[PDB]
């Protein structure tokens, strides 16, 4: 069960890698409608403090979650900055979220009567009074409960079905950066010309088994001419010599 609309669940992911191919795998082929960065470069362009949310809304608001457009969920429940970096991910959830008997666990705020600044959560459970009459009570006229429920009956069509959206976002404020995803480990090649790449080292040469003895911490190796000549294999920790061809 994801969090409802009134309280969008926060989750600050950090100190890990980047992997989003499984996101393509979750649902049949669709479009991300990604705003910040082009979808093909989310695996790369790694940042710090990836900022994730989780809440469930209707189908119409999926296209209405865009920054700049207002409404009820986008205005009174969750708003994005105009310089919002990052983008939303949406998929249909008829088979999980929708209930044949009628699931009413998901509720949204329709009455707040105040513009929301970007990126904050408001929990006004108390009832509101309108009409210049002090209500201060329970179940009275002009005393409206600001929290009302979605209806997720499975007989409805596209546009009213539950959609689970995970709005990722990224911020960059100095910092050493902690979130980045590597990939494409390839086979090692011996006694052949190679365009090698070890731990961010770019060069050309022929790799052979070596004899020098490193230290537990030292990785690279440099010669008199101040060039890389010995490199330690990142995966299996032996030492390979580099020779010109």
């Amino acid at each position: 069960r994801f969090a409802s609309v009134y309280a969008w669940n926060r989750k600050r992911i950090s100190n890990c890698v980047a992997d989003y191919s499984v996101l393509y795998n979750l649902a049949p082929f669709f479009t991300f409608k990604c705003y910040g960065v082009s979808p093909t470069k989310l695996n790369d362009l790694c940042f710090t403090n990836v900022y994730a949310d989780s809440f469930v809304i209707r189908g119409d608001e999926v296209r209405q979650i865009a920054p700049g457009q207002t409404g009820n969920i986008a205005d009174y429940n969750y708003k994005l900055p105009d310089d919002f970096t990052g983008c939303v991910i949406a998929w249909n959830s008829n088979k999980l979220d929708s209930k044949v008997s009628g699931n009413y666990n998901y509720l949204y705020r329709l009455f707040r009567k105040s513009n929301l600044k970007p990126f904050e959560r408001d929990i006004s459970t108390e009832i509101y009074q309108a009409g210049n009459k002090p209500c201060n009570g329970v179940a009275g006229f002009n005393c409206y409960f600001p929290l009302r429920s979605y209806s997720f009956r499975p007989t409805y069509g596209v546009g009213h079905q539950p959609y689970r959206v995970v709005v990722l976002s990224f911020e960059l404020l100095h910092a050493p950066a902690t979130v980045c995803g590597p990939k494409k480990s390839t086979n090692l090649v011996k006694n052949k010309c190679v365009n090698f790449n070890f731990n961010g080292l770019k060069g050309t040469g022929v790799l052979t088994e070596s004899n020098k003895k490193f230290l537990p911490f030292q990785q690279f190796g440099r010669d008199i001419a101040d060039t890389t000549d010995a490199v330690r294999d990142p995966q299996t920790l032996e030492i390979l010599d580099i020779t010109p061809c």
């Epitope: 207002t70 329709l110 009455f111 009567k113 009409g131 006229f141 409206y144 209806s151 409805y156």
Partner: antibody, heavy 118, light 107 residues
Framework: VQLVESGGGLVQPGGSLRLSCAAS????????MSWVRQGPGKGLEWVSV???????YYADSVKARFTISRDNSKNTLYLQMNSLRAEDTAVYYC?????????????WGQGTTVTVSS | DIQMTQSPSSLSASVGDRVTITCQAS??????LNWYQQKPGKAPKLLIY???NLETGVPSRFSGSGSGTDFTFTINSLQPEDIATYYC?????????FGQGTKVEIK
């Protein structure tokens, strides 16, 4: 909780007047106001709506021509037109949106049959 | 925009009998749909809320039901004070659209 009409008179095309509709104690800024259009011999047409957050949604037929605002303390909604093309010989019904999700609140308001002619 | 249509324009033949007034929408819409009742020359009034509720003060015989781009309602008893027009209106899907108009008259 009743609604107070405010409007009248005859105007020429290209001119606009000060449409106002007052409330009897219902908040106009922290609420959901809306005006609609009713013609002699034709059906209703939605004109405009303003939310409590300041979001103005109005029909594309009058794009960039209507300006609407809720008074801070006078409990009266205001609107002004731009560049009348003389098809809005109408009566303008002022109100608030009938129901958010589920409520018994259904009050309406009277409107003045304004006419635009050379 | 949703093309808002209703075929039975004028049910003036019914005098305290079965009434089959109904409305249709182009796109598929849920119960977020209601109607207004308007006497000629004054502001409309509400009878049904969210296509499943009823007005605070009205005869209890009013019962409407509809889903899947089809909304139906019946008024089997034609009291003399209901001689006016009925309008269909879908909302919550901008732009908010209104029906062309339905006529009912007693003989």
């Amino acid at each position: 909780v009743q609604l107070v009409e405010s409007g009248g008179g005859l105007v020429q095309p290209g001119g606009s007047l000060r449409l106002s509709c007052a409330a009897s104690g219902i908040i106009v800024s922290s609420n959901y106001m809306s005006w609609v259009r009713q013609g002699p011999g034709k059906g209703l047409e939605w004109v405009s709506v303003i939310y409590s957050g300041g979001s103005t949604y109005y029909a594309d037929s009058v794009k960039a021509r209507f300006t609407i605002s809720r008074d801070n303390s006078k409990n009266t909604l205001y609107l002004q037109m731009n560049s009348l093309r003389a098809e809005d010989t109408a009566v303008y019904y002022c109100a608030r949106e009938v129901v958010g999700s589920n409520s018994n609140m259904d009050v309406w308001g009277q409107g003045t049959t304004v006419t635009v002619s050379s | 925009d949703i093309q808002m249509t209703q075929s039975p324009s004028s049910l003036s033949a019914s005098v305290g009998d079965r009434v089959t007034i109904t409305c249709q929408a182009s796109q598929d819409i849920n119960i977020y749909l209601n109607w207004y009742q308007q006497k000629p020359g004054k502001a409309p009034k509400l009878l049904i809320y969210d296509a499943s509720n009823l007005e605070t003060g009205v005869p209890s015989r009013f019962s409407g039901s509809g889903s899947g781009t089809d909304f139906t309602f019946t008024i089997n008893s034609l009291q003399p004070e209901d001689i006016a027009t009925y309008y269909c209106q879908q909302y919550d899907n901008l732009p908010r659209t209104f029906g062309q108009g339905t006529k009912v008259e007693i003989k």
